[PDB]
Amino acid sequence: VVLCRESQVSILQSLFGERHHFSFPSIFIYGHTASGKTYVTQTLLKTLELPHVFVNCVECFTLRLLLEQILNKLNHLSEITCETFNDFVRLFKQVTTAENLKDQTVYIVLDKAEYLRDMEANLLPGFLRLQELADRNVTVLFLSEIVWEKFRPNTGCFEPFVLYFPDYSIGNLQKILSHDHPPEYSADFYAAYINILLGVFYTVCRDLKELRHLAVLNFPKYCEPVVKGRDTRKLWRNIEPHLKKAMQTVYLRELPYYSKFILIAAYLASYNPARTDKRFFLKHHFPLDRLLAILYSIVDSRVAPTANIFSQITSLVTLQLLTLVGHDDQLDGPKYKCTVSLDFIRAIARTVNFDIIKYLYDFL
Amino acid sequence: ARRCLDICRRATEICEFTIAHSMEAVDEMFSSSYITAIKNSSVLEQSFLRAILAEFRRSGLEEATFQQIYSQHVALCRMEGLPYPTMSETMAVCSHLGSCRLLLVEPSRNDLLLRVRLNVSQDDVLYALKD
Amino acid sequence: HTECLSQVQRILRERFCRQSPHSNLFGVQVQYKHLSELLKRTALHGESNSVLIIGPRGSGKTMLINHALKELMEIEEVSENVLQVHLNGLLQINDKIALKEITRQLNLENVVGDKVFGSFAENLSFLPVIFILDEFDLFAHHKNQTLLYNLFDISQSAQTPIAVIGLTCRLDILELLEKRVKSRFSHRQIHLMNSFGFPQYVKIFKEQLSLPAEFPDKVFAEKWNENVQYLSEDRSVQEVLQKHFNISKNLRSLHMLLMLALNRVTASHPFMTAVDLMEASQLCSMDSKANIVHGLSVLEICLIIAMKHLNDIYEEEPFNFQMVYNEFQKFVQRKAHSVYNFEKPVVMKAFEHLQQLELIKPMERTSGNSQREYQLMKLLLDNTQIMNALQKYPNCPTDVRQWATS
Ligand SMILES: Nc1ncnc2c1ncn2[C@@H]1O[C@H](COP(=O)(O)OP(=O)(O)OP(O)(O)=S)[C@@H](O)[C@H]1O
Ligand SMILES: Nc1ncnc2c1ncn2[C@@H]1O[C@H](COP(=O)(O)OP(=O)(O)OP(O)(O)=S)[C@@H](O)[C@H]1O
Ligand SMILES: [Mg+2]
Numbered sequence: 093v094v095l096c097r098e099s100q101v102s103i104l105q106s107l108f109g110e111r112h113h114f115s116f117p118s119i120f121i122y123g124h125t126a127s128g129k130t131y132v133t134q135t136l137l138k139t140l141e142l143p144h145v146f147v148n149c150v151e152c153f154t155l156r157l158l159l160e161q162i163l164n165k166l167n168h169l170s171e172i173t174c175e176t177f178n179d180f181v182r183l184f185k186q187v188t189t190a191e192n193l194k195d196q197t198v199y200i201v202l203d204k205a206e207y208l209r210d211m212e213a214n215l216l217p218g219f220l221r222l223q224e225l226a227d228r229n230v231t232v233l234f235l236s237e238i239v240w241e242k243f244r245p246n247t248g249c250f251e252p253f254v255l256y257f258p259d260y261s262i263g264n265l266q267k268i269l270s271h272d273h274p275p276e277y278s279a280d281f282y283a284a285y286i287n288i289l290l291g292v293f294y295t296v297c298r299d300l301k302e303l304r305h306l307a308v309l310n311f312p313k314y315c316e317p318v319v320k321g322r323d324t325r326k327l328w329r330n331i332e333p334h335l336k337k338a339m340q341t342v343y344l345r346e347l348p349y350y351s352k353f354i355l356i357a358a359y360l361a362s363y364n365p366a367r368t369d370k371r372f373f374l375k376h377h378f379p380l381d382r383l384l385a386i387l388y389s390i391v392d393s394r395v396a397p398t399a400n401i402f403s404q405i406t407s408l409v410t411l412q413l414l415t416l417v418g419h420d421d422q423l424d425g426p427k428y429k430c431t432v433s434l435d436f437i438r439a440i441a442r443t444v445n446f447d448i449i450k451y452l453y454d455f456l
Numbered sequence: 457a458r459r460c461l462d463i464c465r466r467a468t469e470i471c472e473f474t475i476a477h478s479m480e481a482v483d484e485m486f487s488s489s490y491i492t493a494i495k496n497s498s499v500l501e502q503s504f505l506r507a508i509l510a511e512f513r514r515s516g517l518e519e520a521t522f523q524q525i526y527s528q529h530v531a532l533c534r535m536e537g538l539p540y541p542t543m544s545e546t547m548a549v550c551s552h553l554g555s556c557r558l559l560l561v562e563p564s565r566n567d568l569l570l571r572v573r574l575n576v577s578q579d580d581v582l583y584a585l586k587d
Numbered sequence: 588h589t590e591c592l593s594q595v596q597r598i599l600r601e602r603f604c605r606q607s608p609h610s611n612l613f614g615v616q617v618q619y620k621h622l623s624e625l626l627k628r629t630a631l632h633g634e635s636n637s638v639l640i641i642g643p644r645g646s647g648k649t650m651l652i653n654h655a656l657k658e659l660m661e662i663e664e665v666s667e668n669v670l671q672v673h674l675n676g677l678l679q680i681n682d683k684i685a686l687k688e689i690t691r692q693l694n695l696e697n698v699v700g701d702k703v704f705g706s707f708a709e710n711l712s713f714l715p716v717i718f719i720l721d722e723f724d725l726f727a728h729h730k731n732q733t734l735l736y737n738l739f740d741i742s743q744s745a746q747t748p749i750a751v752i753g754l755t756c757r758l759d760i761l762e763l764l765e766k767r768v769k770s771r772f773s774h775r776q777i778h779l780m781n782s783f784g785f786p787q788y789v790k791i792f793k794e795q796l797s798l799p800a801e802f803p804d805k806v807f808a809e810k811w812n813e814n815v816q817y818l819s820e821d822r823s824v825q826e827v828l829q830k831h832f833n834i835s836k837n838l839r840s841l842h843m844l845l846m847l848a849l850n851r852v853t854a855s856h857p858f859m860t861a862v863d864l865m866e867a868s869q870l871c872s873m874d875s876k877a878n879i880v881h882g883l884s885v886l887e888i889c890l891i892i893a894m895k896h897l898n899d900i901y902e903e904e905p906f907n908f909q910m911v912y913n914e915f916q917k918f919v920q921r922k923a924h925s926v927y928n929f930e931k932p933v934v935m936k937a938f939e940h941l942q943q944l945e946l947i948k949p950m951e952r953t954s955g956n957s958q959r960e961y962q963l964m965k966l967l968l969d970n971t972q973i974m975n976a977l978q979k980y981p982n983c984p985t986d987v988r989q990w991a992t993s
């Protein structure tokens with residue numbers, strides 16, 4: 093069922109008219125992430141009982157897969173293998189002549205169409221004007237998150253009818269969340285739950301799926317106090333800290349000794365300009381050699397250049413903590429970059445008993 | 457010789473309908489149709505072209521971003537008293553103009569940062585727009 | 588009653604959606620006369636000709652050819668001798684596929700052979716047949732223009748009569764051809780421009796929505812004609828038509844607008860209304876960017892305002908995540924105790940979502956070498972657009988509004 097979705101359904105039903113009637117060649121529907129584009133159109137197609145083929149662009153990452161899946165599903169509605177778009181057109185013309193497919197409109201629903209512009213140059217224009225080429229009462233629908241402005245080819249093509257799905261509001265979200273109430277408690281209880289949850293999280297999280305997931309996760313802790321023995325104040329006081337702890341994470345859901353010194357030296361080399369290096373290390377007044385010199389200066393003990401330190405360097409490179417810049421074949425002048433957050437390096441320096449802030453030129 | 461024979465054939469065709477026939481054949485089968493296409497353009501397209509020319513005169517460069525062109529178009533519309541145009545309408549007009557190779561643009565991905573170059577000489581545009 | 592409404596719905600849907608042929612032609616008398624005369628010359632005699640038709644997309648290029656063919660094929664038994672081949676630049680992208688289509692449409696695969704052998708002298712040696720070429724510009728981008736050259740050669744040859752018709756939206760189709768084919772190309776051009784005034788546009792609108800004389804009910808048809816005639820001079824309808832005529836003179840948009848208007852025609856309202864046309868025009872002329880901005884959340888709005896401030900302070904320069912985060916922190920710290928205590932990861936996720944919606948685009952794309960942080964981003968919006976969208980925001984708080992104004 094659909095809630096707070098009555099204008100778009102009525103518009104689509106008026107557009108379709110009767111089965112023997114014709115319609116637009118191309119309709120482009122765009123909206124936000126949680127607008128329910130997939131739900132509404134699929135429920136409408138199931139209700140009207142129309143011959144429709146549902147296709148995911150991501151699943152059909154190759155042209156042959158797309159055409160073969162379309163043809164196979166259409167045949168099942170009524171093995172076939174095709175390779176070129178012209179062959180697909182010819183086979184579609186051959187297959188559409190069924191009695192069940194004689195005086196009825198054929199619908200090809202495509203979702204996640206954002207990748208279609210990266211598949212082939214002429215595939216999208218061909219799909220746009222399918223009804224002219226086939227001349228067989230065919231309609232093609234588009235679902236996407238990007239506006240039509242960026243789907244326009246350079247040469248220009250047959251403009252589809254553009255449609256927008258309205259964004260949700262507080263009342264609509266509350267109604268949708270309160271529809272699927274658990275049967276073991278009163279509807280007003282779940283309504284109050286949804287109300288407090290929205291009052292806490294609506295500022296950031298407007299995603300229906302995410303908010304519903306959060307409600308499902310946190311309901312068991314909501315229902316504990318009454319089990320333990322309609323007390324709004326009692327429930328709110330018992331439940332507030334848990335809600336704050338949950339809001340701490342909305343969207344989120346021990347190195348070796350010398351490795352720490354290597355990491356801190358790499359951070360210093362990356363974020364400190366070379367001109368000041370001696371100013372921080374020379375007792376009197378990035379390339380690999382600079383790193384080695386800085387490491388030798390920092391460590392109070394004399395470290396021998398054993399191969400194990402080079403193995404540590406390569407292991408750190410593999411662990412995606414240090415990024416290699418130069419060519420892989422050039423292993424005599426290699427370049428490196430450090431990608432560690434500053435809080436992490438401060439924590440590791442604290443565990444090492446080292447004060448990195450005293451050496452950071454930018455902070456000084 | 458081939459185009460001479462073509463001109464003679466076209467002159468015979470027109471005479472079916474003097475030197476005027478040959479002149480019509482030669483100036484129809486050789487002359488460029490850019491001027492008449494510009495003349496038969498719409499009012500908004502004319503305003504867009506005037507805005508492009510004004511921006512080029514102000515700057516002197518042969519490449520201009522879509523944002524400055526849009527600003528000049530808005531100023532020209534305010535001067536002319538025309539209703540305030542949306543960005544989408546201007547982009548649609550730009551795409552339509554670029555389709556017939558009157559301009560040069562790659563609006564497939566970039567929208568507000570499109571380089572625009574005139575595909576015809578500026579004096580031809582001036583002679584088409586003076587009338 | 589209901590049956591008449593269903594029938595008129597079907598007829599108008601066929602007229603608009605499928606673009607069924609109609610005897611009415613507007614401002615194309617000379618061009619159609621010339622083209623039909625030349626087709627008759629090429630059919631009744633062995634002479635060959637080559638013509639290109641140049642026009643903006645949606646200006647009824649195909650209609651001229653279809654009407655001319657339906658007019659002239661049925662004249663005599665010439666249709667028995669005449670053969671037609673249709674080639675579209677979209678379906679046939681390679682010369683091999685074009686050759687396969689030509690062989691299959693001519694039913695010579697039995698004569699030529701079934702295998703993939705590249706020899707085509709079977710047709711070439713054997714080669715009245717007419718050729719129609721949709722999207723003629725695409726063929727000029729082939730590796731050697733072999734098909735176009737061969738077609739022009741056989742047109743100029745004295746073996747068999749061949750008529751070549753091309754369709755193009757580009758006005759520079761002459762310079763996309765090589766010198767040889769250009770020399771062998773008969774300089775026959777027809778131009779399809781919407782050379783008519785606003786009153787003629789109003790007449791076209793009045794005629795297009797007029798029921799044909801073959802409808803069963805006659806008094807209902809007369810009432811419909813009177814209704815559309817009355818709606819013709821209504822100043823709101825004329826205002827809508829003036830707006831759309833200023834926007835574009837293409838008939839395809841007019842057909843789309845009329846179809847959308849007719850969609851709202853029900854049993855309770857058998858005859859349209861000017862308010863219906865106003866509603867259709869409003870529905871056709873809304874900007875998507877403002878809608879997308881309106882569909883955002885509070886945090887995204889704050890980030891966008893910070894981005895606008897960065898663009899104002901640093902004139903036309905890129906930026907990264909760290910500067911935006913720092914100045915958002917400055918904004919939330921200047922205010923005493925506002926409820927905006929958010930950590931780094933959630934703001935990072937919001938920035939990722941904003942980049943996903945393609946309101947922000949990277950410069951000189953690379954990955955691995957540069958993280959998502961420290962990446963040069965730019966905004967794809969205008970200040971007036973942000974102000975207008977923020978004005979219509981449902982529940983914009985006072986603090987963020989004043990920060991935006993500042
Ligand atoms: N208007 C609605 N009425 C009832 N349930 C809805 C509505 N909108 C969304 N839902 C529910 O929310 C679920 C998730 O929404 P989706 O259908 O995934 O949104 P979407 O617009 O299709 O975005 P994508 O394309 O999947 S990323 C659906 O499966 C429905 O159960
Ligand atoms: N002079 C005209 N007289 C009558 N109808 C016209 C005229 N010009 C355009 N039309 C109509 O305009 C509508 C759109 O034309 P189309 O047939 O889509 O364009 P086209 O000829 O296919 O050109 P392209 O480049 O191939 S899309 C059709 O319904 C035509 O009947
Ligand atoms: Mg979906």
Ligand SMILES: [Mg+2]
Pocket residue numbers: 648649
């Ligand atoms: Mg066409």
